[PDB]
Amino acid sequence: SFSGYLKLTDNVYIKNADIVEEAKKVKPTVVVNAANVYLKHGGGVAGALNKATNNAMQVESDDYIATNGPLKVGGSCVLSGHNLAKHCLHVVGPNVNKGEDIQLLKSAYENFNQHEVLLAPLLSAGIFGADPIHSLRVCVDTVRTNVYLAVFDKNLYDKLVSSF
Ligand SMILES: Cc1[nH]c2ncnc(NC(=O)[C@@H]3CCO[C@@H]3C)c2c1C
Numbered sequence: 001s002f003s004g005y006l007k008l009t010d011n012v013y014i015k016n017a018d019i020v021e022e023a024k025k026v027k028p029t030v031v032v033n034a035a036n037v038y039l040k041h042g043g044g045v046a047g048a049l050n051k052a053t054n055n056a057m058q059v060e061s062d063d064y065i066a067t068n069g070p071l072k073v074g075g076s077c078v079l080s081g082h083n084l085a086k087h088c089l090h091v092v093g094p095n096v097n098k099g100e101d102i103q104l105l106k107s108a109y110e111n112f113n114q115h116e117v118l119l120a121p122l123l124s125a126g127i128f129g130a131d132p133i134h135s136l137r138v139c140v141d142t143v144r145t146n147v148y149l150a151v152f153d154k155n156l157y158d159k160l161v162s163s164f
Helices: 019-026 044-052 056-068 104-114 132-142 154-162
Strands: 012-016 030-034 076-080 087-091 117-120 146-151
Touching: 012 132, 012 154, 019 044, 019 117, 019 146, 030 044, 044 056, 056 076, 087 104, 104 132, 132 146, 132 154, 146 154
Parallel strands: 012 146, 030 087, 030 117, 117 146
Antiparallel strands: 076 087
């Protein structure tokens, strides 16, 4: 089970951890990927999760896109979790560096409500360009299911906890 998390609310928990290492250790039912609409897992959380699957995530994802076309910003799809989890919920938060509407971040987090418990990163944070403090607030105010947030950067983790 999940260990070492700091409880923020009734249903939101946080830990300074690499989501890839946390997934390999816990093997949760659902790991969230910080996906883009093409499911091109090049960098950030997506590139790291895909590398941990030996590119199997990318091969599966390319087949999914060839069949279904791209996801919507704010949307998601459930695919295999490979060696990291039972399932991977690929969720597309808005990318501020591309001018995408930050209000779509709430729609992105709503996808989490379809799963009772998830291991997740902060959506739209990191290379997606949004303020992680804002992402955490939208998460707490949107997700009602049990979410275990992994934040890689220790300095940002401390700031997220201390300003909560
Ligand atoms: C490879 C990897 N693994 C992760 N596990 C959890 N969170 C992640 N992301 C961050 O911590 C961002 C860096 C700056 O602030 C963001 C919240 C990652 C990344 C990028």
